[PDB]
Design a protein around this ligand. Structure first.
Ligand SMILES: O=P(O)(O[C@@H]1[C@@H](O)[C@@H](O)CO[C@H]1O)O[C@@H]1[C@@H](CO)O[C@@](CO)(O[C@H]2O[C@H](CO)[C@H](O)[C@@H](O)[C@H]2O)[C@H]1O
Length: 489
């Protein structure tokens, strides 16, 4: 079998499933682990954007009450170390001790915030586990299909510990772990004891090539089979090669810039909203994205389904109001730092370059500050770029896990969110779908735009480039799927 060589924008600091949640982690962890329920992006001939939930580690599942889902596990499934997967492994993945409990903050810092109001799971037998919540939650199934729900082995994980497990992971996935050289590569080999769609590559190498130019030149050479995180400006050149092509898709993610509200200059919404109101997103989509990116109407995405508002007005663009807000704010004229990790996010640097000029024309002076892969101290950062993968078929993620009263934007970044925002966050968690929940999400979307804790830029069009003899198609998520989606020749 052929060894797959990948040229990537970055690598996660840990291969622990939850700690790996990023634009760079899922493409690796999806090969090491499996979930109970899997999303089949290619269901009913869809171009890698289907929302259909299929059985994976769980052969079948059933909803008992408004707060619990039972899982009937697939039998004789093995972890890479040779240990058999049981209800105890699933119970440990969703346990207080490891994920959502107070003691889990040392293992997985974002576990509690990204999790549902979980209760300790119920093991019924070797292949039967009930996942439950303390309060009603109709979000169990979507969470179970997410990047939060990759099954870890209890015994091996407990022996090693979260930090050590992240450097030497063991899962049930189609690709076992081989080696991890920080700031260099991640090597995975074919797991031929795999239960499902069998591995087609003998090995997979995730090689970091931080500079997109070096990455393209690498594919042309040809050092790599598939390269990630390109810009639609790379389409013309790559496609002009007979053996090469680009493969792109709009991903269920949004690029953004956020503030450190612990800093005196960003304590008031005045300057934050002024920066948001000066952002001309349509020219950014023309200049940098060549029409390929999508501008959402606020914290609203179609993957929310019943909680998506298609009648929602576009985010306000008002240069004159922005000027007024800068003047009303306490902003003196002191340069404000904007932190970026080169081009970890596609078009990160050209986007900031454009925005610095937009902000200059409103009275704000913004300065670029770059940081090497792996982040500066919180107190040393003012403005910074970020992204949020909308990991649920509901509006809960990411407005609640990231911007909620138990989330990192308020607790770590110091956003003094209005009481009304936090109250609605509690309702949407517990309530079923209806007018109350729909309007609750809409008022939160209105509060988010008024407060400006973060400024949504656009939905990036993910651009990959591969060798034509490598048959792989992208999915509408910040991950790569190779299950029934990888062949050579
Ligand atoms: O990749 P991100 O956009 O990940 C998002 C998540 O933060 C979450 O909001 C849900 O959607 C995802 O898209 O952002 C990175 C974030 C993730 O940990 O932290 C940053 C900050 O610099 O990157 C660090 O973590 C990475 C993972 O270990 C990364 O490999 C590393 O280079 C770090 O800098 C951010 O880019």
């Amino acid at each position: 079998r052929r060894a797959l060589r990948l040229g990537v924008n970055g690598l996660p600091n840990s291969l622990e499933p939850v700690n790996a949640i990023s634009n760079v982690g899922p493409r690796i962890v999806n090969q090491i682990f499996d979930t109970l329920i899997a999303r089949d992006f290619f269901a009913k001939g869809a171009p890698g954007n289907a929302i259909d939930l299929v059985p994976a580690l769980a052969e079948s599942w059933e909803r008992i009450d408004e707060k619990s889902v039972r899982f009937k596990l697939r039998q004789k499934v093995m972890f890479h170390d040779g240990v058999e997967l049981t209800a105890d492994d699933v119970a440990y993945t969703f346990s207080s001790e490891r994920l959502w409990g107070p003691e889990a903050i040392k293992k997985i810092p974002l576990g509690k915030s990204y999790s549902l109001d979980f209760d300790e799971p119920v093991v019924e037998d070797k292949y039967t586990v009930t996942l439950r919540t303390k309060t009603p939650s109709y979000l169990i199934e979507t969470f179970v299909a997410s990047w939060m729900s990759r099954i870890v082995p209890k015994e091996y994980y407990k022996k090693l510990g979260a930090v050590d497990f992240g450097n030497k992971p063991v899962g049930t996935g189609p690709y076992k772990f081989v080696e991890f050289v920080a700031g260099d590569r991640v090597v995975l080999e074919a797991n031929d004891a795999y239960w499902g769609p069998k591995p087609t590559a003998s090995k997979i190498t995730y090689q970091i090539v931080a500079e997109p130019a070096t990455r393209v030149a690498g594919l042309i050479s040809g050092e790599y089979d598939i390269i990630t995180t390109l810009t639609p400006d790379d389409i013309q050149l790559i496609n002009s090669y007979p053996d090469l092509e680009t493969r792109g898709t709009l991903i269920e993610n949004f690029h953004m810039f956020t503030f450190n509200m612990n800093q005196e200059v960003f304590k008031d919404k005045k300057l934050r909203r002024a920066l948001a109101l000066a952002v001309n997103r349509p020219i950014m989509v023309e200049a940098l994205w060549k029409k390929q990116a999508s501008i959402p109407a606020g914290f609203n995405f179609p993957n929310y389904g019943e909680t998506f508002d298609p009648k929602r007005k576009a985010m306000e663009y008002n240069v004159e109001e922005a000027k007024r807000l800068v003047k009303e704010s306490g902003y003196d004229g002191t340069p404000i730092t904007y932190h970026t990790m080169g081009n970890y996010y596609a078009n990160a640097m050209p986007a900031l370059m454009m925005m610095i000029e937009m902000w200059k024309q409103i009275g704000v002076n913004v300065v670029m500050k770059t940081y090497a892969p792996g982040f500066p101290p919180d107190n040393q950062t003012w403005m910074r770029n970020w992204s949020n993968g909308q990991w649920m078929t509901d509006a809960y993620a990411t407005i609640v896990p990231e911007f909620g009263p138990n989330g990192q934007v308020q607790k770590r970044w110091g956003w003094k969110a209005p009481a009304e925002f936090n109250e609605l966050c509690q309702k949407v968690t517990v309530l079923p779908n209806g007018k109350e929940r729909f309007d609750a999400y809409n008022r939160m979307r209105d509060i988010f735009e008024e407060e400006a804790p973060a400024v949504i830029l656009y939905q990036p069009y993910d651009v990959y480039a591969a060798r034509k003899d490598v048959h792989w198609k992208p999915v509408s998520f910040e991950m790569m799927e190779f299950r029934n989606n990888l062949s050579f020749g």
